[PDB]
Structures are given as C-alpha cells and as structure tokens.
Design a protein around this ligand. Structure first.
Ligand code: XI9
Length: 290
C-alpha cells in the first residue's frame, strides 16, 4: 500500500490492520458494559453529604461520560478505521475521550491528596472543608479540564484516507504538539502525586500499632491497589508513545513501515486506559461496607 498521508498539512502515515478490528471490540464491549453497570450506579447513588463523596461523584461522572462514547470507537474499529458520522461528531467524540480521561485522572489525584491530608495531617483544616468549597473546587477543576482540551473542538481531525475516512488525535506524525505533552503529563505528574501521597499515608500508619491492624491493613492494601491499578492501566500507552517519539526523532516518516508495529501496539494499549474507568467503581466505591 501507500500509508503516507497529510493531516492538517503534516506528513504522517496511518496503518489499517484488521487485527485492530478483530481484537479491540472484544475488550471495548466488555469495558462499556461493565462501565455502565458500575458507574451508572455510582451516579444514581453518589459513590453528596461530604466532600469526599462529592469528589467521588465527579470521578464517576467522568467515567460514565468516557464509557458512553466507547461504542463509537468500537464502530470506528469494526469498520477498520472508517468513521460513518462526519466531522463535527468525531471532533466531539475525541474531545469527550480526552476531557473525560483527564478529568478522571484529576479526580483520582484529588482523592489521593485528600486521603493524604486525612491520614498524615488529622488536624489540618482541609479535613473540615464544607460541601460548598468542594463544589467550587470541583467546578474549577472541570473548567481546567475543558480549557485544556477544547482545542480538540477548535481544530480539525477528520481526513480522507483513500477510500475511507479516518478520525484520530493519535496519528504518527512528525509533529510534536501540546496534545502529546498533555498525554505524557496526565500520567507522569498525577502518578508522582499519587505515589507520594500513598507512601506518606502508609509510612504514617505503620508508626502506630494500637491494636486495630485488621482494618488499617485493609486500608493500606486498598491504597496500594489504587496505585498499581493506575500504573498498569496507563503506563503501557505512554511507553509505546515514547518509543514512537524516539523513532520519529531519529527515523523521520519516509520509510514509515517501521512504525507499523508500534502503531498497532499503541492502539492496543489505549484500550487499557479506558478499562480504568470500569475498575474505579470497584476500587473506590464498592470496597466500602455498603
Ligand atoms: C482512539 C483515539 C483517541 C483517544 N484519546 N483519548 N482516548 N482515546 N484519540 N484518537 C483516537 C483514535 C480513534 C482511536
């Protein structure tokens, strides 16, 4: 074939492997059904009384929004990278994916930091914040997410690939743009925050042994579970993308068959980033004694 293509004037090349149409819908359908059956309940009932419930409600809202748009991704895949709905629709779909993932990560980090303050600084005033301030913080964080990701709606992403129509913010292009920096940061910065907060919480707890280990162990296990779930879900795609950037820097897009494998890898790992949203209800809400 001839994979070289021009997207927004930039020289990329995109590949169309039927393995993507074969393997991904198997994972995306399960992600959709489980995300619905978990997050719809987490929203029906918060996890509204406390700030932590508010933050978890926002996390569930982001996860719900992210999963409800996964059927359109499945459609794009089963047709082997053929969008049937037009430009504005997939502009919106990609914007939703990016904004909802970023919001979910932000609220994971907010919950982690709140736990850190609750366990390490019991008598800080953050532990006694009223619901109003939680609402204002949540609104400002949502506004930050939209302000960061609205350029997707601003810009064009639909391009004609031969006999097909390809919509995608992740074409292998000799163009390092703010979207990729955001994609890397959304992992590296909140990961650092989450791991630090967790390490301090587990260090502070292990200094006190006043005969209630039965439940403190459980809490430590759940903090570790959150950290490892985040890492396993999001690190693979970032790693593949960093390999992609090394390749782009050294081997520009001229013989770009060399990207063929890595490209597939990337789109087989993005799926994991969606799967986080179906795990989160089990990690955060369903673990509580309800
Ligand atoms: C998924 C995806 C995303 C994305 N961003 N955030 N989550 N998925 N951007 N571009 C594309 C092409 C269709 C795949």
């Amino acid at each position: 074939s001839d994979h070289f293509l021009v997207i927004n004037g930039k020289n990329c090349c995109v590949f169309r492997d039927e393995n993507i149409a074969k393997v991904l819908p198997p994972v995306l359908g399960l992600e959709f059904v489980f995300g619905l059956l978990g997050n719809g309940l987490a929203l029906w009932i918060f996890c509204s009384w406390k700030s932590s419930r508010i933050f978890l409600f926002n996390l569930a809202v982001a996860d719900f929004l992210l999963i409800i748009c996964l059927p359109f991704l499945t459609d794009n895949y089963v047709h082997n990278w053929d969008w049937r709905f037009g430009g504005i629709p997939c502009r919106v779909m990609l914007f939703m994916l990016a904004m909802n993932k970023q919001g979910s990560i932000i609220f994971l980090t907010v919950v982690a930091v709140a736990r850190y303050f609750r366990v390490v600084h019991p008598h800080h005033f953050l532990n006694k914040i009223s619901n109003r301030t939680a609402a204002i913080i949540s609104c400002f964080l949502w506004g930050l997410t939209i302000g960061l990701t609205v350029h997707l709606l601003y810009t064009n992403m639909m391009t004609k690939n031969g006999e097909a129509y390809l919509c995608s913010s992740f074409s292998i292009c000799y163009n390092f743009r703010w979207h990729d920096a955001m994609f890397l940061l959304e992992f590296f910065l909140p990961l650092a925050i989450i791991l630090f907060c967790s390490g301090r919480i587990i260090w502070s707890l292990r200094q006190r042994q006043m005969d209630r280990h039965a439940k403190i162990k459980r809490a430590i296990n759940f903090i570790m579970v959150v950290a490892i779930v985040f890492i396993i879900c999001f690190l693979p795609s970032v790693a593949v993308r960093i390999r992609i950037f090394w390749l782009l820097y050294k081997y520009n897009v001229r013989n770009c068959d060399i990207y063929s494998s890595v490209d597939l890898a990337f789109f087989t790992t993005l799926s994991f980033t969606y799967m986080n949203s179906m795990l989160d209800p089990v990690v955060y809400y369903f673990s509580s004694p309800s």
